[PDB]
Amino acid sequence: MKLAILGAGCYRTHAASGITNFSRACEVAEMVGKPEIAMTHSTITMGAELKELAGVDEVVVADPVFDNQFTVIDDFAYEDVIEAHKEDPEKIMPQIREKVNEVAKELPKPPEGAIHFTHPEDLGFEITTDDREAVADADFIMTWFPKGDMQPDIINKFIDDIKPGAIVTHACTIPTTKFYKIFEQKHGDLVTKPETLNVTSYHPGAVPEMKGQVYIAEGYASEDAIETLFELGQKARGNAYRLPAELLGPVCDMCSALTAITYAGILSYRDSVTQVLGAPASFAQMMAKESLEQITALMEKVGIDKMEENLDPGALLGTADSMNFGASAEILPTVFEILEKRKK
Amino acid sequence: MKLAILGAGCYRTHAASGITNFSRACEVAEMVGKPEIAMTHSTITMGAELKELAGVDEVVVADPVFDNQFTVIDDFAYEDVIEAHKEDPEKIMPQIREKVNEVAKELPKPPEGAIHFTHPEDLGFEITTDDREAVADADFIMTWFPKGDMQPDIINKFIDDIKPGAIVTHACTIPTTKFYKIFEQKHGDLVTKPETLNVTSYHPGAVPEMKGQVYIAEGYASEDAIETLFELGQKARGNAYRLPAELLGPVCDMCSALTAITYAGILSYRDSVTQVLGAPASFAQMMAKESLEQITALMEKVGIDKMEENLDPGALLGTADSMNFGASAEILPTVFEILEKRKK
Amino acid sequence: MKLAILGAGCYRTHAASGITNFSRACEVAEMVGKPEIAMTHSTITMGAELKELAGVDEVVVADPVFDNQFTVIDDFAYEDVIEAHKEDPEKIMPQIREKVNEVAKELPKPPEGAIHFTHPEDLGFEITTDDREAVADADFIMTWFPKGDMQPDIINKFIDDIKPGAIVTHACTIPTTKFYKIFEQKHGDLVTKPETLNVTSYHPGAVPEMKGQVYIAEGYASEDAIETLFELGQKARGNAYRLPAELLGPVCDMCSALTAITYAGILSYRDSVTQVLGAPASFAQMMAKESLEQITALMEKVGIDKMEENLDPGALLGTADSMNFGASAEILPTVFEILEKRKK
Amino acid sequence: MKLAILGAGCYRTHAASGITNFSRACEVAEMVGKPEIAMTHSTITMGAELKELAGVDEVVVADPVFDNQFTVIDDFAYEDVIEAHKEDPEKIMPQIREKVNEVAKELPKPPEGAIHFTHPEDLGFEITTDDREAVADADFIMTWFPKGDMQPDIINKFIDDIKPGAIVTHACTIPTTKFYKIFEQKHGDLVTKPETLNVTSYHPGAVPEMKGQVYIAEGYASEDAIETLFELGQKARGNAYRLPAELLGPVCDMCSALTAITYAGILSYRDSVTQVLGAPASFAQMMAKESLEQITALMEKVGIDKMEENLDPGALLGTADSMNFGASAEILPTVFEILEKRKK
Amino acid sequence: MKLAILGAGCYRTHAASGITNFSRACEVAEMVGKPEIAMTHSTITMGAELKELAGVDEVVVADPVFDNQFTVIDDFAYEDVIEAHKEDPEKIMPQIREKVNEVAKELPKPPEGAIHFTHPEDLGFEITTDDREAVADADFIMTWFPKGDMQPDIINKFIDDIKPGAIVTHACTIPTTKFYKIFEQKHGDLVTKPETLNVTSYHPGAVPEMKGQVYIAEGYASEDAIETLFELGQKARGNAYRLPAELLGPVCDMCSALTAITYAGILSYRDSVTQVLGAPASFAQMMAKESLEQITALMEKVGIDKMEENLDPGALLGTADSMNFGASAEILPTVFEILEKRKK
């Protein structure tokens, strides 16, 4: 298998957030005995995992920055980073963040400059600035691009060079639907077998040097492609989730808390209805559909900031008690406390 | 099992059509050795099949007509009808149609009058005019009502008397969606297990005294209820089809020919794409979706009578040839002949 | 009239398909006594037809490739191609395909390289690499561009240089709706007469060197512009079809077979209903709308590959027979055979 | 031709409005020399016109009120009403209104009581309380029913007694779409020619005893039926309008003023664009669509009462002047005055 | 405050229209005693107003044209332009238009060439060709770009250089919704405070050198940002309007006349209903919604050019009279005259 990584990333925004570390990269470095992995970031971490843990034989990284100001900070010893991450990463992260922040004051932003600590060539990756050459014969094209509306112009330079059947993954900067539309080939004048590509995601939560795990979007790749990528992700990232593409946004670090609350509510309510009340799941679903749709419509109509002046949180208290049994009895206590505090 | 048939039917429109006979009723009469079944019609045929072939122990028929002018024509011997249907039903059907047509000139229409040839009491059915009493303890309520907008007022008289879990079937005079809405119980003030009913269909093609077979709508009954009814229908009607409720209309005697052509086209096209061209089914589906949606939208925009002045049938000929292989090669010959004759 | 062709095309994918030839180009070459037309392809064939058969006085072809590796293969004599196409094109096409395939191994793809056999300058066309200069004073701008999402950036370089009222046509790589949006001028601050353009298509089936005919999209150009282009296409391509723009995709070589089957079904069903049954076309249309919409919705809900496990093909057989008369009786035989073979 | 009028009407709400008279009924009375027509109202006026001016040979009026308290006020001489309506109807209308108002204090509302001044039997109409018998053999069924949600139960008693092809008209108390749904016969089990009815309207503006004219809804009857009814209406009501059914509501006495303003604006704007600016009508239409849709959406979003706090009327003044030429220059003066007075 | 103007504009289309002048620029020149303002145009006028009347301390103009053929016409004395605009601008505008038209024959269009009369550096503005440097530290980014589909590629070069919270305004060449989508940042992997921008408009009617006033789109910026911009616009442009973004198009110089007519109708009808009839505004709104929606749907269904053959203008006359009172009585006279002339 040949992996082509399109976009090496820059550390600057990771450092600037103040809240990331190298825990996962350090774990992988120790697993495979290659200390330089410990300070990889972004797609370089993910490529090193795929190469060293999942048997991906050939890795190329393409990014225009390699002909510009690709900057490798060498101030930090890999073994010191590994050691700090064994107990408290914040022993060393403040020094790293301060150095990166200083470099980023004058170093241009990508693709003119990028900040790394391990050169990808030292991981056995090929490097290039030519996306067309990187994707040649690639089985897995891992794209890591800026914001979605810039992606068609980037991709259309190399789309016709992609190997038929290749797995192509998108960054969270674009919805899967829109990324797929770049590749979708519909109508034609010559009846030849289409060069179908398998569009999906290989998207980490947080930043991949910090956390394992990976999210694989379903809906736009074959089952075989999803299974292949899921198994790679299990080996390389430590765990993987395959999920409908339309749920990627809702499970990101900004949104997931709300999706999680709502989902826990749906599942708990469903189980109270079917397991204790004894009604069909379809009954739970009909009630849930109307409840979810109407609370969502209220938010959109009046604004999330004005919901309480339209629906007093206290209005729910008396009637919500009626379903306080079974699975829902685990979650309602906290909900009642919250709504009691917020009632008019 | 108790079956409550709500609506006995009238033969008059069957006779008036000029195109029906008693072939199936005669077949069942011979199978079970009860000649009087041979001239049943409508729900009475279906009830006799369920009782005599599918083990339904108790049958009641409710219809207001039993207190009005329920008319049993006795001019025809069951054995003569059976004998005629062994080779040519039209030996006897013209005499039957003429008699029914004459009776129908003065006999009021249902529910004031109804024309039968076998009294249901002679089949071992209970008869009543009270729908509320008929449905008491019934496991299968087979409704056979006039046009859909009259059904809520009829049903609401007995809906609260129905046994929880009962299977309730609707006539083709109402869509399943609308029939279900009569029964749907949504919101409530007391958390008790809902008295869920299993809404479906048991609908024959043509008229049931003429043809076996039955259509069972999916979407609004439990899987167990659909399976129960499907197995009853196999035994009682000789065959059964379970299908999404929304397809009932499209498979009726007025519509099915078009649905059949379109479906045969979809399946043939799909198979050419996947089996010969080697593309994924999803590719066939994306093309089919746009093709079907746009040809449908054209019809709606300009009228079915004006399609050819907008899309010349000849416009399709050259390009349609490009997919002339595999399964599609069986159906395209006739299609090309048709479009060639219709081209501008 | 001045025609500006934007995009000369490359033969490589035509050769690679294994299924095209020069039949139409050869026919035109013989009609006008210019053998070099016989090995034109793509827009060059169409331009030669317009110039030599439809009186278009001035033709310019613009393509960046003219300053890059525009490659004219001279291995094949025009008269040998013409002679072979009189009886069996496959006497010579394999040699041509093999040569093109070999050249295409190393020649860059367009716009860096392109494969032709007749230089457009030898047809009396002006050549340029500047789209802005090509479109100056052009009455007909025939665009032949890659995939639709690349077209705005190409077109916006020259859109303000187009002559008011010009006819502008798009390749099948973009839907007419989306191409039109590039040109649509809505709001403004100075009330001056808009420089309205006439957006349509001039799109051949298959490849134009192989087959005559042309498809002209309606909906986004004046009636006068459509009529002008239709008459040019009749003369230049031998026949023409004008059709709603939204039907272009559905009539392409990949899709047309399905559209053709469905359309033949609609027309046949309509005619049985109106001509034999004697009902209004509106009755046929109401049934057809529901049938088409529901069979399409089923496909989308369960997948084209799973339709039969939801709607048994055999379910249609009994009821479809009821409309077996009139025009529908020509098409139903094949349909019944297909559904009988596929029934559960 | 046989006309069946279903609903005789009651005068009480006409009198109570304080604003109606018998001008049209008096005109018809004088035209045909039958003074008793002068104090007909509602459908009785329209039936008398159809019989006496349009050759309708047979008229029956059905209404339950004929077996209840059908009340004919005889206090007023027809010739005195005719004479007053020659110059000032308000010489006599106050006396009539006061008498009707007094009678209506104790007389039950229809169908238990109804107030007339001319018994329909004295116009040569048959009277009945049985709708089923009235519609027998009727070519034109003029329904005049209360509010739409009561109409299915009324109509379903007689729908199966209607002559195939009959013209059936609805009161303004129901939209044509909903009335049509009562009659629409879709699916069926026996392929016989449907008994298609021609659903339309014959609806007067104001009250028909006061004003001539009639509105005939298009969309749900054959062209022949609409033409027949239009020609009857021209003769009987003095003028007629045929219009899309969906525009009936918008042209009623409550709504028409707004529809008229908007329509005059659309037509004036269109003509300025095409005739003076010289742009295609499609350009005017694209601008008008967005303008109409967005002003409508604003009203719905903020409420008709809050539009000005969102869109200052003065915001339109400067830019609207730019189209002040041609047809629009006739209507803009008043509009500018209005918006100037309303500006913030 | 730092204002970055992205796009200096070109006068050529203003001159070519034949209908603009420098009235507002001259007024501002006289107000602040800087004659060179009198022949500014486009964003330069607006920048000079903001600097000289609204206290904006720092103005930079970025445009690629400054490194190409930025052309300052010096044939006209500022004081002569000011003097002419005191009484009749057409004393001098024809000479200006002719000169500009001649220059524009050979000068390339922007961004290769642009026509001005006052160099922005002579107004105290910084000039640059680098948008990224112009937006650095800018509080108000006034963009003035060509057609919307070119804007993402322009903006994405500098979007990450914008100061958090900056106000960013768009030209009328793009809808606010689409411009906002360029900037919208949705999902993310690191929970840091988003760098929210305040997207709105600062759009003049006509051309800003001719007319004061400005339109500020609501919906995509904070209330504080809208208020800030509204107050700047009041001072700098002389008046300002804040309105829902979706109404910008409808109030442009091409569309406003129709929007104005319709809005005046809505307000007049509403007031007749509430103030004279005494009904709730919600009653007026329900009627208006149906009227507006249906007249709009008719236009779309049949075409703006075919409305009268479907809805006779005369059909409205009789019923529209019924609401002829109150506010509507001011506007109906003209409407009735128009519809009377147009009736069939």
Ligand SMILES: Cc1c(O)nc(CC(=O)O)c(C)c1OP(=O)(O)OC[C@H]1O[C@@H](n2cnc3c(=O)[nH]c(N)nc32)[C@H](O)[C@@H]1O
């Ligand atoms: C900071 C950051 C991050 O955490 N996550 C993601 C993706 C995700 O979470 O799904 C991205 C894109 C990112 O931004 P970053 O700037 O680190 O990476 C973008 C990369 O994208 C590269 N790039 C820009 N244009 C091109 C191009 O035309 N081709 C290629 N191959 N790389 C390109 C840049 O130089 C840069 O290395």
Ligand SMILES: Cc1c(O)nc(CC(=O)O)c(C)c1OP(=O)(O)OC[C@H]1O[C@@H](n2cnc3c(=O)[nH]c(N)nc32)[C@H](O)[C@@H]1O
């Ligand atoms: C002729 C005919 C037919 O072939 N198929 C169907 C149904 C289908 O194909 O799905 C119907 C309804 C039908 O009409 P028919 O008039 O034969 O049957 C309607 C029956 O419905 C009965 N009925 C009317 N009102 C009531 C009521 O309130 N309760 C009951 N139980 N039956 C009622 C009538 O008296 C009559 O016997």
Ligand SMILES: Cc1c(O)nc(CC(=O)O)c(C)c1OP(=O)(O)OC[C@H]1O[C@@H](n2cnc3c(=O)[nH]c(N)nc32)[C@H](O)[C@@H]1O
């Ligand atoms: C092979 C092929 C084909 O059969 N049909 C179509 C259109 C259709 O069926 O509707 C296209 C576009 C095509 O692709 P091909 O690569 O042959 O043609 C695209 C042409 O488009 C040219 N091109 C690319 N960028 C530009 C540009 O900016 N301007 C112009 N004028 N041509 C351009 C290319 O160099 C090339 O000659």
Ligand SMILES: Cc1c(O)nc(CC(=O)O)c(C)c1OP(=O)(O)OC[C@H]1O[C@@H](n2cnc3c(=O)[nH]c(N)nc32)[C@H](O)[C@@H]1O
């Ligand atoms: C006052 C009034 C009016 O001006 N316009 C309309 C219609 C329109 O403008 O389109 C109606 C219905 C009306 O109400 P009105 O009460 O005058 O008329 C309703 C009539 O409808 C009759 N009616 C009620 N139920 C039935 C029924 O079952 N059958 C028949 N035939 N008439 C019925 C009533 O007794 C009454 O005579």
Ligand SMILES: Cc1c(O)nc(CC(=O)O)c(C)c1OP(=O)(O)OC[C@H]1O[C@@H](n2cnc3c(=O)[nH]c(N)nc32)[C@H](O)[C@@H]1O
């Ligand atoms: C004539 C004209 C006008 O009246 N109004 C508007 C806007 C509105 O009414 O809302 C525009 C855009 C216009 O077109 P004009 O050609 O005058 O202005 C476009 C400007 O936009 C500049 N431009 C083009 N590309 C870029 C770019 O990448 N960056 C910047 N800063 N300016 C650019 C051009 O050189 C030019 O000066």
Ligand SMILES: [Fe+3]
């Ligand atoms: Fe991400």
Ligand SMILES: [Fe+3]
């Ligand atoms: Fe998210």
Ligand SMILES: [Fe+3]
């Ligand atoms: Fe049926």
Ligand SMILES: [Fe+3]
């Ligand atoms: Fe049907």
Ligand SMILES: [Fe+3]
């Ligand atoms: Fe681009």
Ligand SMILES: [Fe+3]
């Ligand atoms: Fe094509």
Ligand SMILES: [Fe+3]
């Ligand atoms: Fe297609």
Ligand SMILES: [Fe+3]
């Ligand atoms: Fe009315």
Ligand SMILES: [Fe+3]
């Ligand atoms: Fe109305």
Ligand SMILES: [Fe+3]
């Ligand atoms: Fe503008």
Ligand SMILES: [Fe+3]
């Ligand atoms: Fe506009």
